[PDB]
C-alpha cells in the first residue's frame, strides 16, 4: 500500500501555518488534512492562571458561540478567577472600612485641635 | 511559476499567439519577400526577458 503523502496546498515549507495530520479515507487511501493551530485557554487578568469553564479556541471562534459558554456566572466571570474575585471583594471592603476609621480619627484630632485653639 | 500576475499572463498570451509559422498564402503574393517568420520564438532558445 502507498504510505507516503503530499501537501494539499502550494506551501511546501513546514511553517506554523502549515500543520497537517494523517487520515485514512473511506476510499482506503492515506492522505493529509491541513489543520489550524490549537486554541489557547483564556487567562485570569490578575494572576494569569487558566480560567476554568472557558473553551480554548482561536480568537474569532468565540464570536460564533453563545454568551454563557464564554463566561462564568459571577462578577468578573470569564475575566478573573474566583480566588482573585474573593481577594478583590475582601480588599475593597477592608479598605473602605479603614477609610471610615481614618476619617473618624481625623475628625477627632481636628476637634481636639479646634478645642485647644479655642 | 504556477503563481503569476495578470500582466505577466497577458504578455505570455501575446507571445503564445505570436508563436506560429507564416501562412502559406503569404509566399504567393505579388512581389513577396517574406520567406519565413524571422521573429519566431522557442521556449528553449531565446528568453522572453520578463
Amino acid at each position: 500500500a502507498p504510505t507516503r503523502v503530499t501537501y494539499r496546498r502550494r506551501n511546501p515549507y513546514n511553517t506554523t501555518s502549515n500543520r497537517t495530520r494523517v487520515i485514512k479515507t473511506p476510499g482506503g487511501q492515506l492522505r493529509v488534512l491541513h489543520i489550524k493551530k490549537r486554541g489557547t485557554a483564556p487567562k485570569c487578568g490578575d494572576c494569569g492562571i487558566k480560567l476554568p469553564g472557558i473553551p480554548a479556541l482561536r480568537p474569532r471562534e468565540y464570536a460564533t458561540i453563545s454568551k454563557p459558554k464564554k463566561t462564568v456566572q459571577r462578577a468578573y466571570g470569564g475575566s478573573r478567577c474566583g480566588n482573585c474575585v474573593r481577594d478583590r471583594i475582601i480588599r475593597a471592603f477592608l479598605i473602605e472600612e479603614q477609610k471610615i476609621v481614618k476619617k473618624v480619627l481625623k475628625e477627632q484630632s481636628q476637634a481636639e485641635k479646634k478645642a485647644s485653639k479655642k | 511559476p504556477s503563481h503569476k500576475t495578470f500582466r505577466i499572463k497577458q504578455k505570455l498570451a501575446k507571445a503564445q499567439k505570436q508563436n506560429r509559422p507564416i501562412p502559406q498564402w503569404i509566399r504567393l503574393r505579388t512581389g513577396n519577400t517574406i520567406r519565413y517568420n524571422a521573429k519566431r520564438r522557442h521556449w528553449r532558445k531565446t528568453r522572453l526577458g520578463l
Binding site: - | 500582466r7 504578455k11 526577458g49 520578463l50
Partner: protein
C-alpha cells in the same frame, strides 16, 4: 567557484517591467526605472548617449496625434464642413 558553480544561484530578479517605458529595467527594491527614470515626472535622457536619445526620440513610435498636426496647419486649423455636403 566564482564562475560556473556560482552562476547556478541566479534565480532572483533585480529588475521587473516598467509601466511607463515597458523595458525590464524597473528596479524591484528601489522602485526606480534605470531606463526612463520612472516614477520621476521627467523622462531620463543624457547628452552623452546620442544613441539612447535616438532610440526613444519623437517619431520612433506611433505619433498618434502629432502626425495629423501638419495637415491641419496646412489647411489653417479650419472647422466646419464643405458647402452643400451631406449630413445633419
Amino acid at each position: 567557484t566564482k564562475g560556473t558553480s556560482s552562476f547556478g544561484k541566479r534565480h532572483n530578479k533585480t529588475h521587473g517591467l516598467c509601466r511607463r517605458c515597458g523595458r525590464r529595467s524597473l528596479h524591484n527594491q528601489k522602485k526606480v526605472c534605470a531606463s526612463c527614470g520612472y516614477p520621476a515626472a521627467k523622462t531620463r535622457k543624457y547628452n552623452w548617449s546620442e544613441k539612447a536619445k535616438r532610440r526613444k526620440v519623437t517619431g520612433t513610435g506611433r505619433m498618434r496625434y502629432l502626425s495629423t498636426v501638419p495637415r491641419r496647419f496646412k489647411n489653417g486649423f479650419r472647422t466646419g464642413v464643405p458647402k452643400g455636403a451631406r449630413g445633419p
